[PDB]
A paper describes a structure:
The [name] (HCV) glycoprotein E2 is the major target of neutralizing antibodies and is therefore highly relevant for vaccine design. Its structure features a central immunoglobulin (Ig)-like β-sandwich that contributes to the binding site for the cellular receptor CD81. We generated and characterized anti-E2 MAb [name], which specifically recognizes a linear epitope comprising part of the CD81 binding loop and the E strand of the central β-sandwich within HCV E2. We show that a synthetic peptide corresponding to a β-strand of this Ig-like domain forms an α-helix in complex with the anti-E2 antibody [name], demonstrating an inside-out flip of hydrophobic residues and a secondary structure change in the composite CD81 binding site.
Diffraction-quality crystals of these antibody fragments were obtained in complex with peptides spanning E2 residues 529 to 540 of strains J4 (genotype 1b) and JFH-1 (genotype 2a). Three independent structures were determined by using the molecular replacement method with the previously determined crystal structure of the unliganded scFv fragments as the search model (scFv-J4 peptide, scFv-JFH1 peptide, and Fab-J4 peptide). Superposition of peptide residues 532 to 540 from Fab-J4 and scFv-J4 peptide complexes confirmed an identical peptide conformation with a root mean square deviation (RMSD) of 0.136 Å, calculated over the backbone atoms, which together with the unrelated crystal packing interfaces for the Fab and scFv complexes indicated that our crystal structures reflected the genuine conformation of the polypeptide chain recognized by MAb [name]. In view of the similarity of the individual complex structures (two complexes per asymmetric unit [AU] in the scFv complexes and one complex per AU in the Fab complex), we selected for further analysis those with the lowest mean temperature factor (B-factor) comprising residues 532 to 540 (indicating the highest degree of order). The peptide interaction with the paratope buries an area of ~730 Å2 on the peptide and ~650 Å2 on the antibody, with a total buried surface area of 1,379 Å2 and a shape complementarity index of 0.801 and 0.774 for the J4 and JFH-1 peptides, respectively, similar to other antibody-antigen complexes. Unexpectedly, the peptide forms one α-helical turn comprising residues 535 to 539 (DVM/FLL), in stark contrast to the extended conformation observed in the cE2 structure. Residues N532-T534 interact exclusively with the light chain, forming an N-terminal contact region. The α-helical turn of the peptide with residues M/F537, L538, and L539 establishes mainly hydrophobic side chain interactions, predominantly with the heavy chain, forming a second contact region at the C terminus of the peptide. A detailed comparison of peptide residues 532 to 540 with the corresponding segment in the cE2 structure revealed that the short α-helix observed in complex with [name] folds as strand E of the β-sandwich in cE2.
Author numbering:
A (entry chain A): 1 to 122, 139 to 248
B (entry chain B): 1 to 122, 138 to 248
C (entry chain E): 530 to 540
D (entry chain D): 532 to 540
The structure:
Amino acid sequence: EVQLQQSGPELVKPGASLKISCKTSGYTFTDFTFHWVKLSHGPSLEWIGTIKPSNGDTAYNQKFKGKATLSVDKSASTAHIEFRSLTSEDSAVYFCARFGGSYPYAMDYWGQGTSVIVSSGTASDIVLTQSPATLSVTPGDRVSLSCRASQGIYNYVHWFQQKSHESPRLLIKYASQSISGIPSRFSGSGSGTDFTLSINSVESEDFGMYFCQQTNKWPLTFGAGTKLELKA
Amino acid sequence: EVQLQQSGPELVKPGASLKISCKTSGYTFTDFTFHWVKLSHGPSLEWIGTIKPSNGDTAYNQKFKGKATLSVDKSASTAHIEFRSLTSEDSAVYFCARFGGSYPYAMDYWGQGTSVIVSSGTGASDIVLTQSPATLSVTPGDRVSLSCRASQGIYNYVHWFQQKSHESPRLLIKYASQSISGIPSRFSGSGSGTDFTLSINSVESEDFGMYFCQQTNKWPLTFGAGTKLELKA
Amino acid sequence: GENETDVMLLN
Amino acid sequence: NETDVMLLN
């Protein structure tokens, strides 16, 4: 049983520095790259960066380069992210995830997330277009979710479900590959620029946000999401 | 076993409304008033308001009157707070607490707190409580005294709380000097009127954290800015 | 009114 | 395939 356990909720003053942690169990910590993801309103997901725990190599989203530093403590099997000069714009839920599993790897295990509050006191990036933005359906309807890439990315698309108060869950990797434990109603297709996630028959437990993600080019990017909701 | 269980972390857009909850177990929900407290940097504590679950009577801190609405769902034994027109200034940890226990009542049980993030995207006569020193650096074994001075006479209506990092406040002393079950003997309180003291006979390593005083004699209920007890270099 | 919170909090 | 060295090897 693999687990990524994140440190507790934080509340800091503007201008402060903050280090948050991600500790692993059930597998060899140096096996897979660690990723940090920022959750903002929508919900919306942004990729901050990645660290390779075996050698400490990093790759950052340029938007976060002056803000966050990724590090690992191999002796403690713990990954860290340190923020500097925190502002109201940094208040968010931050997730850690590993990029592993059976080959080819994907963001398969995620931490529970860390809420960070910064208290007020007393261009060449791949664009992923998700449509329809909202799907209002009755359980039993068959649905299809689209993800259009700004340029050809072969089969480097992955699909995530995100339910309220929960961490993202990997549904499909590399456009069409099935994930262990994921129900058979979820399937994916496409290559190049047009990708589809199909849900054979929507269940009540499926309502939430669905995000596509590309991992062909730096920075890794997400679509804006499709909200799957119960028809009024 | 009494428990106040708060709903999970929230993240919303500016201008949104949000209802957060506090569900009780192990006692009769209508027994005691429910209170909501805002935690901001410092840490700093502010009292938002109270609701009496038996009859629905409320009393608000005027600073939060146009922002928050308190309610109870007696059928679900759940207390609620609803925020409107949320802004970055509202991002905080919100605690629910009951004002009960053995008579005279005090904020004895607290929820674990709810982190509310309002995402940026991709009272002329209120009682002032002066706490000193603001920071106290000590070595375990040291005898310490923490002061709480009220802006005017409040009789014995002072309560002391300990708050450790990532934890909810813990009631140490109620009504200036009354001892609390399970609280170690090293903690004691004294004073009446305007001058109040919390003494720690001999400080232990587990005592490091924030110490807040609170007055419940006048509306709105108020807190001191706290004394940060830390280890000496 | 020296005990204005008593009706709400203690009764 | 600029991410393979980092993510897959």
